[PDB]
Scaffold this active site. Structure first.
Site, short mmCIF file in Angstrom:
data_model
loop_
_atom_site.label_atom_id
_atom_site.label_comp_id
_atom_site.label_asym_id
_atom_site.label_seq_id
_atom_site.Cartn_x
_atom_site.Cartn_y
_atom_site.Cartn_z
N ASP A 92 0.89 -1.16 0.00
CA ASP A 92 0.00 0.00 0.00
C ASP A 92 0.93 1.21 0.00
O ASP A 92 2.14 1.06 0.17
CB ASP A 92 -0.92 0.02 1.23
CG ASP A 92 -0.17 -0.09 2.54
OD1 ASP A 92 1.04 0.21 2.59
OD2 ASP A 92 -0.80 -0.47 3.54
N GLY A 94 0.97 3.80 2.18
CA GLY A 94 1.31 4.33 3.49
C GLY A 94 0.44 5.51 3.87
O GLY A 94 0.27 5.81 5.05
N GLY A 95 -0.11 6.19 2.86
CA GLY A 95 -0.95 7.33 3.13
C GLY A 95 -2.08 7.07 4.11
O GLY A 95 -2.31 7.87 5.02
N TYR A 96 -2.78 5.95 3.94
CA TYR A 96 -3.89 5.60 4.82
C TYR A 96 -3.48 5.50 6.28
O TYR A 96 -3.99 6.24 7.12
CB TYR A 96 -4.49 4.26 4.39
CG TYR A 96 -5.73 3.87 5.16
CD1 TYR A 96 -6.99 4.27 4.72
CD2 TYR A 96 -5.65 3.09 6.31
CE1 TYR A 96 -8.15 3.90 5.42
CE2 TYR A 96 -6.79 2.72 7.02
CZ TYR A 96 -8.04 3.13 6.57
OH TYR A 96 -9.18 2.76 7.25
N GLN A 193 -11.40 7.45 -5.67
CA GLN A 193 -11.97 8.02 -4.46
C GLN A 193 -13.31 8.64 -4.83
O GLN A 193 -13.85 8.34 -5.89
CB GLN A 193 -11.04 9.08 -3.87
CG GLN A 193 -9.75 8.53 -3.26
CD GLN A 193 -10.00 7.52 -2.16
OE1 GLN A 193 -10.92 7.68 -1.35
NE2 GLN A 193 -9.18 6.47 -2.11
N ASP A 270 -7.96 -7.86 0.25
CA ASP A 270 -6.94 -7.93 1.28
C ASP A 270 -7.61 -7.60 2.60
O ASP A 270 -8.57 -6.83 2.63
CB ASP A 270 -5.82 -6.92 1.03
CG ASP A 270 -6.21 -5.51 1.45
OD1 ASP A 270 -6.77 -4.76 0.64
OD2 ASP A 270 -5.97 -5.16 2.62
N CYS A 308 -13.04 -27.98 5.48
CA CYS A 308 -11.74 -27.38 5.23
C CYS A 308 -10.66 -28.44 5.08
O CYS A 308 -10.60 -29.40 5.84
CB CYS A 308 -11.37 -26.43 6.38
SG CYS A 308 -9.76 -25.65 6.16
N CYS A 310 -7.31 -27.67 5.13
CA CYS A 310 -6.03 -27.14 5.60
C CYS A 310 -5.37 -28.11 6.59
O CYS A 310 -6.03 -28.94 7.21
CB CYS A 310 -6.23 -25.78 6.27
SG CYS A 310 -6.73 -25.86 8.00
N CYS A 313 -7.01 -28.45 10.12
CA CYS A 313 -8.23 -29.24 10.23
C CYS A 313 -8.00 -30.73 10.04
O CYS A 313 -8.86 -31.54 10.37
CB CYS A 313 -9.27 -28.74 9.24
SG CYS A 313 -9.90 -27.11 9.67
N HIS A 339 -5.49 -21.78 9.46
CA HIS A 339 -6.82 -22.20 9.06
C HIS A 339 -7.60 -21.08 8.38
O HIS A 339 -8.13 -21.26 7.28
CB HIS A 339 -7.63 -22.70 10.26
CG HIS A 339 -9.10 -22.79 9.97
ND1 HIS A 339 -9.64 -23.79 9.19
CD2 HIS A 339 -10.13 -21.96 10.28
CE1 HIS A 339 -10.93 -23.57 9.02
NE2 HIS A 339 -11.25 -22.47 9.67
C1 LIG Z 1 -7.89 -0.97 7.38
C2 LIG Z 1 -8.44 -0.75 5.95
C3 LIG Z 1 -7.34 -0.29 4.93
C4 LIG Z 1 -7.99 -0.11 3.52
C5 LIG Z 1 -7.44 1.01 2.64
N1 LIG Z 1 -8.12 1.82 2.01
C6 LIG Z 1 -7.32 2.75 1.28
C7 LIG Z 1 -7.63 3.90 0.39
O1 LIG Z 1 -8.79 4.22 0.15
N2 LIG Z 1 -6.52 4.57 -0.15
N3 LIG Z 1 -5.10 4.18 0.15
C8 LIG Z 1 -4.75 3.10 0.98
O2 LIG Z 1 -3.56 2.75 1.24
C9 LIG Z 1 -5.98 2.34 1.58
N4 LIG Z 1 -6.14 1.21 2.47
ZN LIG Z 2 -8.94 -25.64 8.31
#
Ligand SMILES: CCCCc1nc2c(=O)[nH][nH]c(=O)c2[nH]1
Ligand SMILES: [Zn+2]
Ligand SMILES: CCCCc1nc2c(=O)[nH][nH]c(=O)c2[nH]1
Ligand SMILES: [Zn+2]
Lengths: 372, 372
Positions: A92, A94-96, A193, A270, A308, A310, A313, A339
């Protein structure tokens, strides 16, 4: 393989199933990406993560730039080498997190300044620095640096943030392209956005498509708006994004959310829910989640889930895992996490298989009836 | 295999190397037994414990009788089934921990009463109840229930405790023999007491040999008397025990202690040092232990130990593990513990090999020169 190649093999309604080919490997979509917070998928060796079926994992930039350091990891050979995962890694921007975990954040058109929630030290994260850090980490799928719009958000505030993110998207794109090695071996995803507003989402989509990206994420929906609202926004938002590129719904991981999101065109997911659910005691099953700490599981010899496949299990009972979690043992977190991630990957496989066979809608109906 | 068969294949001075054959498997001696506190070897799957080379693990009775419950585990199929370890398991009697962790303990000739350091609930542990609990757990090597004499100890106090433990040893023996299934499938070890006094140790040894056991442990030496003192006591204590049966030094695990103990006739060891060293950051190497948290390891690409052949040293660097531990990640504890237990097993293998080849004394000298 190529730097990046997304191919759709089958469709059903808005749902798609296919693959993304990258230098470090192939990613089957719809895909679920386990999250590695501090260069580690919580309580799991990389081989175990792969054993669950994961084709790619997500690395958090914010945390990495702080704890170990971007420059340090690069000097150590990159994140893949560092943590022992040789397949694709999406990071990601890092902004968030900077707007969530960080403190005393100062935002401007140039970027964001903040004090680490660890050392209290200051840092200035910008589109250019974010791209550089992701490069230093050796990220395969780079996320453009943006500003996640808070929920609820007024039309004007949502517009300003969106417009700024779009400006930052252009900067991310140019920063990424100027770095030859990065532009040639990694991919860049733009993030849409616009909060819950259709016209804003459309503007963001046009601007993002205008810039041109390898994939498009739907951002700003992991903010607590409720599944109904999220689904509503996805209904008109996903169609706005280019159809021949991956659609990534950030921070969405509940099973029912994933199914509904795929029904609306999302290809990538994710979430830390699976990992965090490893310590809190929540285990996913096809009959809905259960909290293994509950006393009713103290003598339950059955596996976490009856179907499952895995390793957990196959080998351990609910009774044993119940004991482990309540006793606060590390093995409890290891088994619960393996799991849950395996369950998620099995979910994605059932989604991919049902799409390829044109019976996804039915699968979704069957899934919900039993899950709820 | 037989219920229990100890055979010495080679000797050098007081050192011996051989095997103990039991129904669930063979144990190579000298042996190091990883410790499973709450039905789990800290941060390791049973398969990983076995992968390090361990032939047997130790289960703590005190903890098990409290947290999950002896009766509960039996109903669940026994400890082996419960935790997924199908090889031999040696369980301590619980007497020791009751005098350490427990609270408001009331001791009498009948046994010991105490309040759980968890629920504060009361319990009356005796030779008969201890043997029963170990049976319920399905223990392969049962330890007689005794009273660990505190250090320092006056001759009279040490005599009384020792004499009582000897009385308790007889009761353990009879309790064990009355339970047909247990007497026929498990082994029973008596424990020598007498503090640091030779005459007391000799009396204890004669009484224990008089009762007759499958193995003999040297108890009361993991009390902080110092290696020199411990070695001194072992010098005259081990020869007192029957030569054709295993000699188990309880609670001794530092590498140098193990080597010196084997030089004095000990065949079995156990310690949490390896596991606890997984979280505290202490990693064993042939050049002595190191604390991986130290800043000098932040960019060290080398494995924990240059020679260790464990999976951790093949795949991850000190730099990565350094990061994991300081970041408080579970994977850090997993990797540190696998390495340390693997290191210990490699130590035992080098001891067994050097004894079989008649070069143990030299190995010990070489080991110490480099280790210190
Ligand atoms: C805990 C939920 C994290 C989800 C997320 N949304 C965003 C988003 O809307 N813009 N940039 C990001 O890194 C990001 N990460
Ligand atoms: Zn399992
Ligand atoms: C933390 C060190 C534990 C070692 C130990 N010594 C002893 C002993 O001397 N008698 N009985 C026992 O269970 C026991 N355990
Ligand atoms: Zn190692």
């Amino acid at each position: 393989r190529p730097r990046f190649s997304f191919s759709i093999a089958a469709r059903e309604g808005k749902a798609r199933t296919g693959t993304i080919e990258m230098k470090r490997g192939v990613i089957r979509t719809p895909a679920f990406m386990p999250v590695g917070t501090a260069a580690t998928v919580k309580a799991l060796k990389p081989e175990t993560v792969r054993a669950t079926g994961a084709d790619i994992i997500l690395g958090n930039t914010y945390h990495l730039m702080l704890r170990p350091g971007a420059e340090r990891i690069a000097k150590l050979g990159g994140l893949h080498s560092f943590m022992g995962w040789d397949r694709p890694i999406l990071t990601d921007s890092g902004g968030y997190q900077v707007m969530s975990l960080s403190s005393l954040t100062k935002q401007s058109e140039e970027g964001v300044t903040f004090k680490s929630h660890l050392d209290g030290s200051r840092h200035m994260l910008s589109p250019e620095r974010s791209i550089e850090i992701q490069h230093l980490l050796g990220s395969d799928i780079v996320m453009a640096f943006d500003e996640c719009t808070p929920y609820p958000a007024t039309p004007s505030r949502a517009a300003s943030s969106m417009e700024r993110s779009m400006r930052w998207a252009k900067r991310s794109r140019d920063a990424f392209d100027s770095r030859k090695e990065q532009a040639e071996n990694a991919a860049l995803f733009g993030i849409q956005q616009g909060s819950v507003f259709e016209n804003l989402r459309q503007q963001s989509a046009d601007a993002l498509a205008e810039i041109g990206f390898d994939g498009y994420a739907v951002g700003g929906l992991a903010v607590g708006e409720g599944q109904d609202e999220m689904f509503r926004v996805l209904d008109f938002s996903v169609p706005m994004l280019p159809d021949d590129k991956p659609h990534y719904l950030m921070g969405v991981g509940k099973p029912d959310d994933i199914v509904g999101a795929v029904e609306r065109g999302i290809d990538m997911f994710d979430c830390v829910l699976p990992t965090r659910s490893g310590r809190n005691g929540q285990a996913f099953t096809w009959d809905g989640p259960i909290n293994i700490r509950n006393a009713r599981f103290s003598e339950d010899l059955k596996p976490l889930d009856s179907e499952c496949h895995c390793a957990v299990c196959q080998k351990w009972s609910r009774a044993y895992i119940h004991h482990l979690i309540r006793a606060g043992e590390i093995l409890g977190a290891m088994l619960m996490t393996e799991h849950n991630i395996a369950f998620y990957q099995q979910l994605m496989q059932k989604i991919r298989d049902s799409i390829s066979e044109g019976r996804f809608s039915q699968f979704a109906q069957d899934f919900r009836a039993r899950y709820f």
